[PDB]
Design a protein around this nucleic acid. Structure first.
Ligand SMILES: [Mg+2]
Ligand SMILES: [Mg+2]
Ligand SMILES: [Mg+2]
Ligand SMILES: [Mg+2]
Ligand SMILES: [Mg+2]
Ligand SMILES: [Mg+2]
Ligand SMILES: [Mg+2]
Ligand SMILES: [Mg+2]
Ligand SMILES: [Mg+2]
Ligand SMILES: [Mg+2]
Ligand SMILES: [Mg+2]
Ligand SMILES: [Mg+2]
Ligand SMILES: [Mg+2]
Ligand SMILES: [Mg+2]
Ligand SMILES: [Mg+2]
Ligand SMILES: [Mg+2]
Ligand SMILES: [Mg+2]
Ligand SMILES: [Mg+2]
Ligand SMILES: [Mg+2]
Lengths: 101, 393, 176, 124, 46, 344, 239
RNA sequence: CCUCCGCAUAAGCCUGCGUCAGAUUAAAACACUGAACUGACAAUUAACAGCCCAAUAUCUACAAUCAACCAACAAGUCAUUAUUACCCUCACUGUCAACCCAACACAGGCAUGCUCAUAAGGAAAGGUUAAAAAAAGUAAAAGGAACUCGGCAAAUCUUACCCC
RNA sequence: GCUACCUAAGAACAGCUAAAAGAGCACACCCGUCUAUGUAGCAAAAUAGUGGGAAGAUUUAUAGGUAGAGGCGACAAACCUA
RNA sequence: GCUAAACCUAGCCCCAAACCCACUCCACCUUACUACCAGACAACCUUAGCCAAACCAUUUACCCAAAUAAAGUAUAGGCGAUA
C-alpha cells in the first residue's frame, strides 16, 4: 500500500499483511526490443521488486522468474507561458521475466 | 602522576538539577508530559530496559557475572602473541632443552641419493619463480599472496613422491584447525590455543627421536631464567576461560596424529611481521601444544613422565626464510623444574633464496642482474624434504 | 494470467464499450466486508486494465475508446474505501472513543506556528531518542514580531478581499 | 548557480548522496557487517487476495437498479444494529448486569489482541 | 587571470553552507527563514 | 567499454546467450571415447584403481568438514558454501591428485592452483552507436571474462582433442534478436586481461581440469524458492561454457593465436562444477578463435562443449556417516583426472 | 568551529598513537601561536614520567630491562623502551643507556646515601650531594615535569631536615620534599646544540612557518639586561 | 588535410542533435532539416558504485622505497585476543546526452586512469578578386648594430668585468 | 565553493645526467620574463612565441576551520566571490 | 500605407466596522519535505549612529493613558541648539 503508515515490525512479531492494496500498475509496450519472456510494467514509486512479484503471483497468478526495476526521470524542460518549468512526473518501470518458459 | 584522559574529551556531567528537587513535599512540574524538551522545566527519567531480546543491539552482562569467570588469571598464547625473550621464553614455558641441529634420522632419510626429487633444483627454482613473479597479473606479488602459495607448492612438490614411497597415502593437510592445551607451570596456569595455516595429519604417530637414555640424561639440565622480565610477559592474561585440553579432532577421525605444523608470516608490513626469534618461539609453543593435547587425549589427564613420548614437527616460513623444528614431549608434569625435560631440535635462519628481481634492473641501458631468484640454497629444500619424509620411508 | 491486463479481445479497437453505473456508497454499505474485499480486487483488476489501455492509446496516438470507464472505476473504489473507513471509524469511536487513528498532538514548532504533529512509532523512548531530541517544539520569542507581521499580512489580504466584494456588489446594484 | 526550485531527488548529489536518499519505498530488512542485506519475511507486506471463482459481483452496476437516500454509517447506528437487540433481550430476561459488558462485544483494553483500533496496528 | 568562474559547484558544500539544518541551527538563521516566509519566497533555503 | 561476462550468473537463460557470445555448440553427455587407436598391449601389469580407497578418501574429506570439525562460530546458514564446502573441495582435489599421481604420471609434474584468476578478452560482432556525437558509427562488441575457479590444474603438455578441428554438428548456435544489455549485461572500461592462471613465462601453459563451486546466491533451494525450477542446470551450463571458453582462449592466445591467425590445432579443457553436494562435468574444445565480423563471414568452425546433468555425490549426510554415496560421480572425477597428454 | 583534541585516550599503551596537528590554532579556530604548521606526520609514543610506579598486586622497589633505545620525533631527547615484570613502557633515555642494561626504581630512603649508576631513580634524599639528576618532580608522586630535554641536567645541592635543594639548567634553585623521586644522570641525545638546520626546507619539515616580513622597530626591551638570579622556588607547604 | 587528441571514472549538470508530426509561422547568426525548436512518444534494467557492522574488557616497539645487501631522517599510510549474544538473506538508490564553471554553441578554467598517435576524434577556405594600410610568415645582393634609450625583435650560439 | 593561511585523509611528477643533492638538462604539470596582437577583445586580463620552476619551502582533487571595531598575510597597505 | 495609435477593468488606496488564521491520506530540524534505535547542550542582558548645534567634544523631539485646555507655562540645558 502507498500513502499509509506501515506498522513497525518487532522481532518475533506477526506477519505484515495488506488486505486492500493501493498499488495500480500499467502493462506497457516496450520501446526497444526485449527477450520473449520479458514483460514491461509501469509501477508506482513506492512499489518494490518483492511487492511486484507478490502482486503478480497473488492477483493474476502469473509465474514470475525475475524482476528488475529502474526510475525514469521525467523532463523538467518545458516552460509555461510565464516561463515556469513544467515537470513531467518521474516514474518507475519494471522488467519481469516469466518463470516456466 | 599524569592521567591520560583530557577532560575536554571526557564525558560532560549533566547540569545541576533544578532547586525545586530540594523542597520536600513539593512535586516539580516538568515537560515529561509534553514528550519534548522546552527551555523552562526538567525531568528525571528511570533507566530503560527491553522486555525482549534483540541480537543487533545486545549488551553483554558485566564481566564478573560471566559464568566462566575465574578469580585466578590464565595466560593465553595465541597466534598473535609475540614473546619478548622469544626462544628462552618458550623454553621456560614448555620446560624443554634445545638442540642446535636437526635430528639425525631426518638427515639420514634425505641423504639417500634415490630419495631426492627427479629434477630437484630446477623444480624448486620454478616453484620460487612462480610464487614470486608469475602467480598473478600484477607486476610484483605481495607477501600476503606469495608466502602461502610457495609453501603449498613446496608441499605438493614433496607430495609428488608418493609413487616412490607408497606410504604417504595415509596423510592429509588440514586447514582451519585448532589446538587447545592447558598446563600448570609453577602455579601459573598457562594455556595455548593455536590456529595457524595448516597441519600435516597422518594415520600413524611419528617414531620417537631421542632414546630413554637421552630422556633420563636430560634431568641434569637447568632451564635458563630471565630475572627482570617474567616468563609470562606478552601473553593474554584472561580471567574468563575454560579448562579444556582438547584437540581439533575427536575419536573416529582417520588422521588423528599430527605430523608437521606450517606457520606462515602473511604480512606485507615489517612491523606486522614477526621477528625470527619470535616466530621460532611461536612454532615451539605450537608444537608443544599439539604434543600436549595428544598426550592428554591418549594418556589421561595425569601428570606423569611418559614412557611413550609424543613427537610433533613444525616449520615456520616468512616466504624466503625458513625455520625448522622437531619437538619431542616426554613429560605431562610441568609445575616442578627438576624432572626430565622435553627436547626440541631447532634449525634457524635457513634461506631458500637471498633476493628475487621481479623486473630487470637496468643501469645505463644494459642489464646487470636478470629476472629471477638471486642466491639459491638447495640444502633448505633438502631439510624441507627430510621433514616431509620423516614419517614414511 | 497476463490476459487480464486487457479486455475481451472482441472489444479491441471497437471505439465504444457500453457500460456504466459506478458503485454508489449506499450500495456498497449494503454489502458485507468479505464482499467488499472481493469487489475491491475486481475493481483493482478492472482499473489496471483500463490504465493499460489508456497508456497504449496514448502511445498509439489514438483516442481512448471510452475514457469514462476509468473515472467510474476510480470513484467506485473511492466509495468502497469510504464505506470501509466509515465502518472502521464507527468501531474505533465505539471501542476507544477516538478519531484520528494516527496519534498526534497540537504542538508549536521553532517558527512559532501551531501545528498538528503526528507520531512516528519508534522503538526506543523519546528521552533517549537522539534524533528526536534535536527537533525543537518551542518558540524562543525572537519570532513573535514575525508572528505579528504575518498576522498583519493576513489582515491586509482579508481587508482587500472584503473591500473588493463591496465594490463588485456596488457595481452590480448600480447596473441592476 | 544551483537549481533551487527543482525537487531534491536521489539523482542529484555526489556518490554518497546517491543511494542514501531513496524514492519512498519502505524497507524490508537491514544491513550487516559485510554490507549484506538481510531480508525479513515478516517485514514484506503479504498480499491477502481472496478467491473469486464463485463471486457474482461485477465492477459495474446495472442502470435498472434504483436510487436510495444516502445514510453515512455512524457509531450510534452500528451500536443500535449490533448490540442493542442482544442487550434488550438479556435485560428483558433480567440477566443483563452492567459490570460485565464484555460478552456484548466490548473490551476494556486494546493491547491484548492483534488488530488494535486506536493506534491502528494493521496496514489497510 | 580571468575571474568569472568563482562558482565551483559541489552539493556537499552547498547543503552544508546554506542548508535547512544549518539555517535552523542558529537563531539568526531561523530569522532568515522567517524573513523568507514573510516575503513569500518559494525556496526558503538550499 | 566492454561487456563484463560472469560465468556464475543470475541471468535466466544465460547459457544460450553465452553460446552466442562465444560461438559454442552444447551437447548432452561426454565426448565419445577415442577408440581409433588400437592398444595391442592389452595384457599388462595395469595397476587397477582402488575404488574402496578412493571412496574412503572422498568420504573422509567429506566428513572432515560437513559432519565434523572443531568449528567456532555457529556456523551460520549463509557462508556455509565458503566455510565448509570450499575447504572440502580443495582438500578433495589435492588428495585425489596425490593419490592418482602413480596411475597418471602427468599429474605429478602438474601445477595445482587455488582460487587463481583467469581472464579472457575478445570481440564478437558489431553495432551502430545509437546516441551521441558518435551516432551512426560502427563499434565492435567487446567482451571480458574475469573468472576465479576454486581449483585449477595446469600442465606443460597439451591434452588430446576429443573431435577433429573441422567436426560438424547439425544443431546450430542460438542467436538473440535483442541486445546483449538485456540479458542483463552491463558495460565497463578497465584493463583488458588475457590470463591463463599464470604469466607467459610459466612452463605449465596448458590446462587440464578446473574445479568450480557455485556461490550462495545460486543455491538449489533459492532457485526453487524464486519459482525457477528449470533454471538449475542453466547456471551449471553457463558457468562451464564461460569458464572453459575463457581458459581455452587464454591457452590459445598464449601460443600466438588470435582472430586473424586462428589456430593450427584445437585446444581442450575439462571442468567439474559443483554445489556443496551436486556435481556436473564438462569438456570443452576451442576450435575457432576468429569470432569478429571480419573473421566470421566464411567460418564454419564451432567451439564445442559437452555436459552432463548434475548428480548428487551423496545423500543426507547425517550421524557421522554418509547415508548415500553415488560411486559413479567419484568415478567421473577420477576419470577426468586420469586424462593424459597423448604420447606416441 | 569543531575542534576536538587528539589527546583523547584513557589507557596507557606502547604502540604509537596518531597525533593531529594544530597550526597554532586554539579550539576557536583562530591563530593563537604564530609560525606553526605543516611538517612531517608524526606519531606519539607515550612516555611514563612517573618513573617509580609498581605493578598491580606488587609494592616494593623493582628492576627493569632496557629493551631498546629509539628516536622520538616528538621531543629533543631519545626514549628507551624498557620492560619489567609483565609490562613494558617508554621512558626518557639518559646518556649511556643501551639495550641490555638493567635499571633500578627504588622507593625506600636510606639512613646513608646509596651509590647509583647513571640510569636509576631514587628519592632525592637517598642520593649523594652533588649528583647530576634529571626528570625531577615537585610534589612526591607528581611525575617528572622538570629537566627532560636533550643533554640537559641539574644538580642536587643540599639536603635539609625534610627537603632537598636542586639547581635547574637555568640555574634557578628549587626546594622539593625529600621523598621526591628523580633519575640519576644527564639526559641523552647530547650534542643537540650542534645540529645545523642547513636550509629553510629542514625547518619546514620540522613544522615551523617563516617569520613575518613586517619590520618591527625595537623598543626598550631590546638591550641586554643583567638581572640577579630569581629567588628560591619552594614547593613545601607549611602551616 | 588535422589531431596537444581521445575513451572512461570522479565532480558538476539534469533529458539538453532518439523517433513521429508542424514546419504556414517561429531560434537555425543563411539554408537543407537539426546542437541555438514546438508538441507527442520512447528510454538509463546490477554483477560496477553507493547504502555497513552486538557488546564489555584486552592487544597493537620493529616504516616505505622490487625489501634482499647498504644507507639514512623529516621517523612513517594498514594486525588482535578473551567471554556472552546471534542460524532470517540478495532490498533500496545512481546508470541518458553532443554535458560542467565562465551572461554565449565563449581561443579561457577543469581531478584521476588508460594508447601516447591513435583502432579515438575532427575540418583552417560562403563565392570571387589580387589595390593601399594592417597582422603572421618565408627569402634576400654588398655591409654587418652604422639601428635604438637600450642588440627590442630576429638570427646565430656566445667571451670578460661590475653593482645588488 | 575565489583567494590568504591552516587541519584531516588522498594523488601526481616521463626521459637523460644519477656526485649524495630545497643538484643540472628536460616532458606532463605549476608560474608568468620579454615581445607582438588584442583593447565593446576569444577573454571585465586572452592568444602566439619566448621564458622561470619542474623530488620539493613542489603541484594538486576532496571535506572541514579562521570574518569585518575582524580574519589571514615568507608586509605587497597583499587577499577575504570579477 | 506600414510601423503604429486608441480603449475599461483587472485590481489597488484611504477609512469605518469587526479582535484573525491554520490536521483529507503521506512526508518534512539528518543533505528539510528522508517509515524504523542509548548522552539526556539549550533563551532570558542599557541600542548605536546619521543628523542639529552652521565645526565638535555635554547635549539633539521619536517612548504606545481617546480628545480639548492648563501650555509651549512651570522646569531642563556647552542656560545653547533645543528639550
Ligand atoms: Mg628570526
Ligand atoms: Mg625582518
Ligand atoms: Mg553511459
Ligand atoms: Mg565572460
Ligand atoms: Mg575517425
Ligand atoms: Mg571551415
Ligand atoms: Mg580564400
Ligand atoms: Mg571570405
Ligand atoms: Mg640581406
Ligand atoms: Mg649606435
Ligand atoms: Mg643614430
Ligand atoms: Mg631577444
Ligand atoms: Mg632542483
Ligand atoms: Mg629544470
Ligand atoms: Mg615596505
Ligand atoms: Mg607603501
Ligand atoms: Mg553639525
Ligand atoms: Mg547646514
Ligand atoms: Mg569637517
Amino acid at each position: 500500500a502507498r500513502n499509509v503508515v506501515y506498522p513497525l515490525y518487532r522481532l518475533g512479531g506477526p506477519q505484515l499483511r495488506v488486505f486492500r492494496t493501493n498499488f495500480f500498475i500499467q502493462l506497457v509496450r516496450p520501446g526497444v526490443a526485449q527477450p520473449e519472456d520479458t514483460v514491461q510494467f509501469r509501477i508506482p514509486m513506492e512499489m518494490t521488486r518483492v511487492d511486484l512479484r507478490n502482486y503478480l503471483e497473488g492477483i493474476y497468478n502469473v509465474p514470475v522468474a525475475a524482476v528488475r526495476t529502474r526510475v525514469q526521470h521525467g523532463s523538467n524542460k518545458r516552460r509555461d507561458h510565464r516561463n515556469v518549468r513544467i515537470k513531467k512526473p518521474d516514474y518507475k518501470v519494471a522488467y519481469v521475466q516469466l518463470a516456466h518458459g | 602522576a599524569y592521567e591520560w584522559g583530557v577532560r575536554s574529551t571526557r564525558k560532560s556531567e549533566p547540569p545541576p538539577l533544578d532547586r525545586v528537587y530540594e523542597i520536600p513535599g513539593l512535586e516539580p512540574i516538568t515537560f515529561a508530559g509534553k514528550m519534548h524538551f522546552v527551555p523552562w522545566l526538567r525531568p528525571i527519567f528511570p533507566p530503560w530496559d527491553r522486555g525482549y531480546k534483540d541480537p543487533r543491539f545486545y549488551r553483554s552482562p558485566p564481566l564478573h557475572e560471566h559464568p566462566l569467570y575465574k578469580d585466578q588469571a590464565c595466560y593465553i598464547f595465541h597466534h598473535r602473541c609475540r614473546l619478548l625473550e622469544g626462544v628462552k621464553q618458550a623454553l621456560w614455558l614448555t620446560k624443554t632443552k634445545l638442540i642446535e641441529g636437526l635430528p639425525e634420522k631426518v638427515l639420514s632419510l634425505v641423504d639417500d641419493p634415490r630419495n631426492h626429487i627427479e629434477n630437484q633444483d630446477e623444480c624448486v627454482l620454478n616453484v620460487i619463480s612462480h610464487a614470486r613473479l608469475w602467480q598473478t597479473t600484477e607486476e610484483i606479488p605481495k607477501r600476503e599472496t606469495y608466502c602461502p602459495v610457495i609453501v603449498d607448492n613446496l608441499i605438493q612438490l614433496c607430495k609428488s613422491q608418493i609413487l616412490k614411497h607408497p606410504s604417504l597415502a595415509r596423510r592429509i593437510c588440514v586447514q582451519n584447525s585448532t589446538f587447545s592445551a592447558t598446563w600448570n607451570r609453577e602455579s601459573l596456569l598457562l594455556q595455548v590455543r593455536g590456529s595457524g595455516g595448516a597441519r600435516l595429519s597422518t594415520k600413524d604417530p611419528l617414531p620417537t627421536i631421542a632414546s630413554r637414555e637421552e630422556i633420563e640424561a636430560t634431568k641434569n639440565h637447568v632451564l635458563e631464567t630471565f630475572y627482570p622480565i617474567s616468563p609470562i610477559i606478552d601473553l593474554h592474561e584472561c580471567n574468563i576461560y575454560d579448562v579444556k585440553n582438547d584437540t581439533g579432532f575427536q575419536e573416529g577421525y582417520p588422521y588423528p596424529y599430527p605430523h608437521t605444523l606450517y606457520l606462515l608470516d602473511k604480512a606485507n608490513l615489517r612491523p606486522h611481521r614477526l621477528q625470527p626469534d619470535q616466530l621460532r618461539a611461536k612454532m615451539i609453543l605450537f608444537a608443544f601444544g599439539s604434543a600436549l593435547a595428544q598426550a592428554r587425549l591418549l594418556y589421561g589427564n595425569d601428570a606423569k613422565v611418559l614412557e611413550q613420548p609424543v613427537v610433533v614437527q613444525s616449520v615456520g616460513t616468512d616466504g624466503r626464510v625458513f625455520h625448522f623444528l622437531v619437538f619431542q614431549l616426554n613429560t605431562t608434569d610441568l609445575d616442578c623444574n627438576e624432572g626430565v625435560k622435553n627436547l626440541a631440535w631447532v634449525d634457524s635462519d635457513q634461506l631458500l633464496y637471498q633476493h628475487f628481481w621481479c623486473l630487470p634492473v637496468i643501469k645505463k641501458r644494459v642489464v646487470v642482474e636478470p629476472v629471477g631468484p638471486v642466491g639459491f640454497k638447495p640444502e633448505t629444500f633438502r631439510k624441507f624434504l627430510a621433514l616431509y619424509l620423516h614419517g614414511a620411508a | 494470467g497476463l490476459e487480464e491486463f486487457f479486455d475481451d479481445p472482441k472489444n479491441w479497437g471497437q471505439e465504444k464499450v457500453k457500460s456504466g453505473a459506478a458503485w454508489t456508497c449506499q450500495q456498497l454499505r449494503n454489502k458485507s466486508n468479505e464482499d467488499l474485499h472481493k469487489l475491491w480486487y475486481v475493481l483493482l483488476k478492472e482499473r489496471n486494465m483500463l490504465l493499460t489501455l489508456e497508456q497504449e492509446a496514448k502511445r498509439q496516438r489514438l483516442p481512448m475508446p471510452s475514457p469514462e470507464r476509468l473515472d467510474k472505476v476510480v470513484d467506485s473504489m473511492d466509495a468502497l474505501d469510504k464505506v470501509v473507513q466509515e465502518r472502521e471509524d464507527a468501531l474505533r469511536l465505539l471501542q476507544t472513543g477516538q478519531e484520528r487513528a494516527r496519534p498526534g498532538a497540537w504542538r508549536r514548532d521553532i517558527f512559532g506556528r501551531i501545528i498538528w504533529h503526528k507520531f512516528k512509532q519508534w522503538v526506543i523512548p523519546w528521552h533517549l531518542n537522539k534524533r528526536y531530541n534535536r527537533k525543537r517544539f518551542f518558540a524562543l520569542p525572537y519570532v513573535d514580531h514575525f508572528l505579528r507581521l504575518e498576522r498583519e499580512k493576513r489582515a491586509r489580504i482579508k481587508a482587500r478581499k472584503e473591500n473588493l466584494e463591496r465594490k463588485k456588489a456596488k457595481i452590480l446594484l448600480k447596473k441592476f | 548557480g544551483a537549481d533551487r526550485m527543482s525537487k531534491w531527488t536521489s539523482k542529484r548529489g555526489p556518490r554518497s548522496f546517491r543511494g542514501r536518499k531513496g524514492r519512498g519505498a519502505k524497507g524490508i530488512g537491514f544491513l550487516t557487517s559485510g554490507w549484506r542485506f538481510v531480508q525479513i519475511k515478516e517485514m514484506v507486506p503479504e498480499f491477502v487476495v481472496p478467491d473469486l471463482t464463485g463471486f457474482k459481483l461485477k465492477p459495474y452496476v446495472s442502470y435498472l437498479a434504483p436510487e436510495s437516500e444516502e445514510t453515512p454509517l455512524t457509531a450510534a447506528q452500528l451500536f443500535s444494529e449490533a448490540v442493542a437487540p442482544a442487550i434488550e433481550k438479556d435485560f428483558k430476561d433480567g440477566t443483563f448486569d452492567p459490570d460485565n459488558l464484555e460478552k456484548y462485544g466490548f473490551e476494556p483494553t486494546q493491547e491484548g489482541k492483534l488488530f488494535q483500533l486506536y493506534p491502528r496496528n494493521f496496514l489497510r | 587571470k580571468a575571474r568569472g568562474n568563482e562558482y565551483q559547484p559541489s552539493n556537499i558544500k552547498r547543503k552544508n553552507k546554506h542548508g535547512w539544518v544549518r539555517r535552523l541551527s542558529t537563531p539568526a538563521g531561523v530569522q532568515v527563514i522567517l524573513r523568507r516566509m514573510l516575503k513569500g519566497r518559494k525556496s526558503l533555503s538550499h | 567499454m566492454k561487456y563484463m561476462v560472469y560465468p556464475q550468473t543470475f541471468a535466466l537463460n544465460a547459457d544460450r546467450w553465452y553460446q552466442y557470445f562465444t560461438k559454442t555448440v552444447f551437447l548432452s553427455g561426454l565426448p565419445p571415447p577415442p577408440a581409433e587407436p588400437e592398444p595391442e598391449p592389452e595384457p599388462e601389469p595395469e595397476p587397477a584403481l582402488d575404488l574402496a580407497a578412493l571412496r574412503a578418501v572422498a568420504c573422509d574429506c567429506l566428513l572432515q568438514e560437513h559432519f565434523y570439525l572443531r568449528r567456532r562460530r555457529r556456523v551460520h546458514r549463509y557462508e556455509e558454501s565458503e566455510v565448509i564446502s570450499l575447504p572440502f573441495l580443495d582438500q578433495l582435489v589435492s588428495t585425489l591428485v596425490g593419490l592418482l599421481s602413480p596411475h597418471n604420471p602427468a599429474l605429478a609434474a602438474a601445477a595445482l592452483d587455488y582460487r587463481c584468476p583467469v581472464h579472457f578478452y575478445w570481440v564478437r560482432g558489431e553495432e551502430i552507436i545509437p546516441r551521441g556525437h558518435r551516432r551512426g558509427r560502427i563499434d565492435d562488441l567487446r567482451y571480458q571474462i574475469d573468472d576465479k575457479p576454486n581449483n585449477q590444474i595446469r600442465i606443460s603438455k597439451q591434452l588430446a582433442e576429443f573431435v577433429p578441428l573441422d567436426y560438424s554438428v547439425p544443431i546450430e548456435i542460438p542467436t538473440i534478436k535483442c541486445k546483449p544489455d538485456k540479458l542483463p549485461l552491463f558495460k565497463r572500461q578497465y584493463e583488458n586481461h588475457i590470463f591463463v592462471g599464470s604469466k607467459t613465462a610459466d612452463p605449465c601453459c596448458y590446462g587440464h581440469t578446473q574445479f568450480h563451486l557455485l556461490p550462495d546466491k545460486l543455491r538449489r533451494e533459492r532457485l526453487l524458492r524464486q519459482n525457477c525450477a528449470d533454471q538449475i542446470e542453466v547456471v551449471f551450463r553457463a558457468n562451464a561454457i564461460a569458464s572453459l571458453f575463457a581458459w581455452t582462449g587464454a591457452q590459445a592466445m598464449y601460443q600466438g593465436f588470435w582472430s586473424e591467425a586462428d589456430v593450427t590445432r584445437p585446444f581442450v579443457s575439462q571442468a567439474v562444477i559443483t554445489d556443496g553436494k551436486y556435481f556436473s562435468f564438462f569438456c570443452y574444445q576451442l576450435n575457432t578463435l576468429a569470432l569478429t565480423t571480419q573473421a566470421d563471414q566464411n567460418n564454419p568452425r564451432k567451439n564445442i562443449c559437452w555436459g552432463t546433468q548434475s548428480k548428487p555425490l551423496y545423500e543426507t549426510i547425517e550421524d557421522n556417516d554418509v547415508k548415500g554415496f553415488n560411486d559413479d560421480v567419484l568415478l567421473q572425477i577420477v576419470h577426468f583426472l586420469l586424462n593424459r597428454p597423448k604420447e606416441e | 568551529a569543531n575542534f576536538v583534541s587528539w589527546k583523547s585516550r584513557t589507557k596507557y599503551t606502547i604502540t604509537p598513537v596518531k597525533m593531529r596537528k594544530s597550526g597554532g590554532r586554539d579550539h576557536t579556530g583562530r591563530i593563537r601561536v604564530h609560525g606553526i604548521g605543516g611538517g612531517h606526520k608524526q606519531r606519539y609514543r607515550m612516555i611514563d614520567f612517573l618513573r617509580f610506579r609498581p605493578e598491580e598486586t606488587k609494592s616494593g622497589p623493582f628492576e627493569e630491562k632496557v629493551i631498546q633505545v629509539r628516536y622520538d620525533p616528538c621531543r629533543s631527547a631519545d626514549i628507551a623502551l624498557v620492560a619489567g615484570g609483565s609490562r613494558k613502557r617508554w621512558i626518557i633515555a639518559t646518556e649511556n643507556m643501551q639495550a641490555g642494561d638493567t635499571i633500578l626504581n627504588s622507593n625506600h630512603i636510606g639512613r646513608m646515601a646509596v651509590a647509583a649508576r647513571e640510569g636509576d631513580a631514587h628519592p632525592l634524599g637517598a642520593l649523594p650531594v652533588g649528583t647530576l639528576i634529571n626528570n625531577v618532580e615537585s610534589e612526591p608522586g607528581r611525575g617528572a615535569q622538570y629537566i627532560r630535554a636533550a643533554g640537559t641536567c641539574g644538580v642536587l645541592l643540599r639536603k635539609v631536615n625534610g627537603t632537598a635543594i636542586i639547581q635547574l639548567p637555568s640555574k634557578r634553585q628549587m626546594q622539593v620534599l625529600e621523598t621526591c623521586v628523580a633519575t640519576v644522570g644527564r639526559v641523552s641525545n647530547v650534542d643537540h646544540n650542534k645540529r645545523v638546520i642547513g636550509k629553510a626546507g629542514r625547518n619546514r619539515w620540522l613544522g615551523k612557518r617563516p617569520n613575518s616580513g613586517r619590520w618591527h622597530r625595537k623598543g626598550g626591551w631590546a638591550g641586554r639586561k643583567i638581572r640577579p638570579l630569581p629567588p628560591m622556588k619552594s614547593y613545601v607547604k607549611l602551616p
